[PDB]
């Protein structure tokens, strides 16, 4: 029997002035309840959308969530794909509806803020909400006002895109003129697979018709070490290849139609590619096709960057086109979820001590934007240190600095880290000159000899010195910062001694292991991570406003952190 909620929904549809329905509810084999209903328009109709449009309301349940979706009718429904909507494709199945469900949840500019409101929880209220949003969406689509000034330019939905394979590239603003004069030209391109990843590739270099380098892409040292295979063909187009109104071409014929609309010819391009492949004996066969076009970030703005789309590579066939997802791995497109200020992201940073605190600080700095880092250490990594450290068992037996540098270079595609295996101060003059090229010097060793050697070293220019250290049992943190040609050691030592810190007791000091004599200082991983985060924030604040700064931090049993500053 038809349940009461569906009867109430039927009454709701019947009552609405701009909606009519005659068919009743029907349960499917997949436990989906569907109802056929017609909708009207209050705005002059367009060619793409008729006035009386037939839709199907479908409700189902997956695990504990109830899905409410309106799908176009296969016979008397809309056939084109608009913005904020999935691809409207009709398949050969018992389904009476298509797959072009409008994305009602998205709120365009035309959608009023008060009209949008919020989504209810009860099924009937949710149904009413969805139906009102559907009416708004259909009138907006009729007006061709779904995308207006100020909205983001979302890419059209592509049919049958593999959810595993990804292609990466790097295009910046300054690269726009270089391609601007090459509209209508085609060439070859090479790619490399990401080591250890699953189904990911990235572009490396661009060639021309006869196979000559025109541009090379800069990557991280981890990515730069790889085999380059030329298996792509690139061609620059005037605009985005999209069919009216926002439909992505599904067959080769539609792509050729869009090419003809732009003013180019796909078969001529294919013939030229074949001829050039015959000419060059080294070239075997391209496997991918790349289409480049200028793209904007908002509607009403002007293009500033080139976007590339990839398809698995004839023009006259009706076969479906295989599409592959592409991502821009440019520096400004990597940390859109939060990044540090430009004042610290443009500095070269040197860190002395690749132990517990230093490794975590370096990892955080690499993840927040600072990419030019150097590490100074001359010790070896052991299994015990991994109790409080940022590396794993695959780095045991290596120099700490080198392993940390490799790990940092494996983080993001714009990393550039260097390692020094010597101990401060270096003996060779060349190493001293290399060290004197950094702007910020950070000390995370906890050793007084390093502090004296820093004061005994000739830096030949003004530098920013930061010293960070923890107390006994990791109950507190000393942070000191200065901006001078030479490091002040007496003032730092006086500030360290003046602060109230716990006394060292040998009872809590456990021996490193059986058959050993020297003890170790007690510290858990969470305390070190806490202090590393606090120190990173301190470094950012110091770089923003340089000067003579000293601060002491103390952790409390309830989980709070208190701060004692010093007035100069």
């Amino acid at each position: 029997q038809v349940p009461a909620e569906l009867q109430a929904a039927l009454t709701l549809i019947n009552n609405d002035p701009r909606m009519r329905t005659n068919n009743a509810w029907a349960l499917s084999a997949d436990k989906r309840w569907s109802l056929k209903f017609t909708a009207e328009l209050s705005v002059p109709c367009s060619s793409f959308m008729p006035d009386n449009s037939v839709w199907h309301l479908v409700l189902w349940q997956e695990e504990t969530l109830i899905r409410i979706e309106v799908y176009p009718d296969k016979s008397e429904g809309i056939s084109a794909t608009f913005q904020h909507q999935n691809y409207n494709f009709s398949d050969a199945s018992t389904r009476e509806w298509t797959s072009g469900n409008p994305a009602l949840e998205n709120t365009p500019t035309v959608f009023g803020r008060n009209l949008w409101g919020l989504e209810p929880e009860a099924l009937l209220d949710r149904i009413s909400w969805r139906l009102s949003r559907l009416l708004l969406w259909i009138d907006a689509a009729a007006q061709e006002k779904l995308a207006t000034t100020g909205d983001a330019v979302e890419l059209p939905a592509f049919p049958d895109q593999s959810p595993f394979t990804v292609i990466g590239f790097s295009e910046q603003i300054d690269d726009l003129p270089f391609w601007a004069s090459k509209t209508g030209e085609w060439g070859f391109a090479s790619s490399t697979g990401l080591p250890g990843a699953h189904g990911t590739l990235f572009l490396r270099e661009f060639l021309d018709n006869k196979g000559k380098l025109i541009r090379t892409t800069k990557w991280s040292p981890f990515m730069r070490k790889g085999a380059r295979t030329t298996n792509a063909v690139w061609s620059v187009l005037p605009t985005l290849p999209v069919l009216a109104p926002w439909q992505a071409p599904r067959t080769w014929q539609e792509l050729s139609h869009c090419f003809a609309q732009c003013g180019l010819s796909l078969p001529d391009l294919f013939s030229d590619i074949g001829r050039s492949v015959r000419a060059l004996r080294k070239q075997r066969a391209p496997g991918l096709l790349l289409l480049g076009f200028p793209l904007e970030n908002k509607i009403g703005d002007e293009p500033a960057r080139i976007h590339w789309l990839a398809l698995r590579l004839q023009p006259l066939s009706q076969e479906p086109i295989r599409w592959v997802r592409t991502q821009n791995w440019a520096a400004d497109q990597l940390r859109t979820r939060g990044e540090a200020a430009n004042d610290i992201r443009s500095k070269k940073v040197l860190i002395i001590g690749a132990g517990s605190l230093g490794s975590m600080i370096a990892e955080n700095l690499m993840r927040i934007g600072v990419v030019s880092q150097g590490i100074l250490d001359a010790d070896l990594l052991q299994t015990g240190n991994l109790s409080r450290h940022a590396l794993t068992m695959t780095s045991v037996g290596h120099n700490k600095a080198a392993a940390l540098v490799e790990h940092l270079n494996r983080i993001l595609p714009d990393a550039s880290a260097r390692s020094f295996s010597c101990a401060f101060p270096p003996e060779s003059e060349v190493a001293k000159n290399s060290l004197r090229q950094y702007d910020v010097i950070i000390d995370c060793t906890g050793d007084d000899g390093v502090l004296k050697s820093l004061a005994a070293f000739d830096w030949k220019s003004e530098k920013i010195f930061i010293s960070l250290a923890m107390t006994w049992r990791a109950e507190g943190l000393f942070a000191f910062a200065a901006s001078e040609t030479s490091f002040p050691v007496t003032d730092a030592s006086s500030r360290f001694n003046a602060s109230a810190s716990p006394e060292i007791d040998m009872d809590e000091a456990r021996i490193e292991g059986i058959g050993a004599w020297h003890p170790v200082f007690p510290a858990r991983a969470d305390d070190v991570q806490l202090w590393a985060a606090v120190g990173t924030k301190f470094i950012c604040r110091v770089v923003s406003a340089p000067g003579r700064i000293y601060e002491y931090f103390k952790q409390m049993p309830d989980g709070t952190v208190e701060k004692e500053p010093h007035e100069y």
Partner: protein
Amino acid sequence: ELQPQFNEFLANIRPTDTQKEDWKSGARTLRERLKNFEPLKEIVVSTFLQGSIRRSTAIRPLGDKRPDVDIVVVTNLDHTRMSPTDAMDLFIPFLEKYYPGKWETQGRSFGITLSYVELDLVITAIPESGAEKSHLEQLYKSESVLTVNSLEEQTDWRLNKSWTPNTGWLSSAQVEDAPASEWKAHPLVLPDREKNEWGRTHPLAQIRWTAEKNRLCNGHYINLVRAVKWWRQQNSEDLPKYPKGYPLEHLIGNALDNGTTSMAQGLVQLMDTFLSRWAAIYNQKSKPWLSDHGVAEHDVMARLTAEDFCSFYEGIASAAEIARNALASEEPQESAQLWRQLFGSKFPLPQKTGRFA
């Protein structure tokens, strides 16, 4: 003659180490910043440290008062055309940029407030032209002039452009001083109190003479100057406001005789010679005339009143009585107490925190 107690007193009356690193680092940083400034790149020729700090004749200020550190910036401007006010005004943007809210102009000088010390800088100019100016600039750009160490640390320091700091693993050739024909007759020009006219100064000869006098006195001249300054500080109520500073040091240097064996003997000889030389001037109620080491046409005791000199003479006589009875006393405790009568309480009577990373 109770030498270790005198050494402990000297150690107690010297400036602390925190201040020392502060002034050294501040001088170096200021030099670098001045060099890198584009608007004054060609104008500035040199920046060097002078005063009691360089000559090792300074004492620790009582309280939390910041010590005074004297610096000189030598430029290549022509004083015959530019007024002192314009030359001092050329440096305002640099101070406003690098030292915001920490600098103040007073008299003929600029004063900068650091963490523990206070810098006092004066703008000076070279009054020569031609190859003479080139030679003078080459001398002013040498390591002998651009050193931040005091005279006590560098006992081998000499006024020569071919001199290098001699550093050994635990403890080579000793270059001697330059002839007077190259530096003595070439002073510098500096602003006056009212910044209305340029006067003459010559600090390098003062430093050289101080070094030579200390060498001939077996390293006791500077310590005796410090002791006399501390005595002046202790008995301030019964002593006049002046002399103080460089004039007092000049009087002390004139009074002393070459070949000092120990501190107490030197003090007694100093006071006795001071009493002997200026007795005639004292009974006539006048003041002495002393020529500056650099400029021979200037009087150091030019702003000193006669009554100030008379009061200082009386105080010196009393201190001489006390020192004379102190030296003869053979009992160590009694002699130490007699010395403590003048110098004060600071005259004696016979921690690293744990940091992990």
